[PDB]
């Protein structure tokens, strides 16, 4: 199936049971979510974006259910303005950018 | 053809003759480039990203040559850390995100 890019490519995912609407971003290397708690087993991280950078908590082998699949992967939490799934999860989902 | 997302989806584009390497970003609504000059007929703009926001100069109907096509479209210039083509140009290029 495919997303055509006239509207934002947003889907609902479940991160450890929690429903979250995420933007599928090919220019994000990482996926960073807010408003979910995944606990104390994290390594701290800083990721940069357009206007500067943010403090994140990187979690490993989190389970994500999205577009019919359950995959486990790396989620960060931090004060992102919008939740994004970057290429680490999109490669896990077999997504490609076609033309 | 397609980009698989294990490496960043980077291509070379020519913006009014100038060669620039750009990241194709499905989570950018706009395309913002640096290190090119497109002149004085612009409207100023502020776009937000992950860490905050930036001042940009929005140019209309600029000509872009990329992946075998010449299209004219809206380019912004500002202090972006990496040059991005967002969904305004990717829809013009018939790109979709497939899975």
């Amino acid at each position: 199936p495919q997303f055509h890019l006239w509207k934002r490519p947003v889907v609902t995912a479940h991160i450890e049971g929690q429903p979250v609407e995420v933007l599928l971003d090919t220019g994000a290397d990482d996926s960073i979510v807010t408003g979910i708690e995944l606990g104390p087993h994290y390594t701290p991280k800083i990721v940069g974006g357009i206007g500067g950078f943010i403090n994140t908590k990187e979690y490993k082998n989190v389970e994500v259910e999205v577009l019919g699949k359950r995959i486990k992967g790396t989620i960060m939490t931090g004060d992102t303005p919008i939740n994004i799934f970057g290429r680490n999860l999109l490669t896990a989902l077999g997504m490609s950018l076609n033309f | 053809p397609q980009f698989h997302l294990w490496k960043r989806p980077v291509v070379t584009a020519h913006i009014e003759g100038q060669p620039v390497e750009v990241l194709l970003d499905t989570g950018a609504d706009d395309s913002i480039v640096t290190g090119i000059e497109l002149g004085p007929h612009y409207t100023p703009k502020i776009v937000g990203g992950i860490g905050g926001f930036i001042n940009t100069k929005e140019y209309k109907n600029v000509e872009v040559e990329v992946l075998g096509k010449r299209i004219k479209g809206t380019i912004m210039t500002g202090d972006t850390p990496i040059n991005i083509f967002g969904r305004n140009l990717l829809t013009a290029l018939g790109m979709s995100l497939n899975f």
């Binding site: 991280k45 974006g49 950078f53 | 990241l23 992950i50 991005i84």
Partner: peptide, 4 residues
């Protein structure tokens, strides 16, 4: 877009 984001990276480190």
């Amino acid at each position: 877009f984001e990276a480190l």
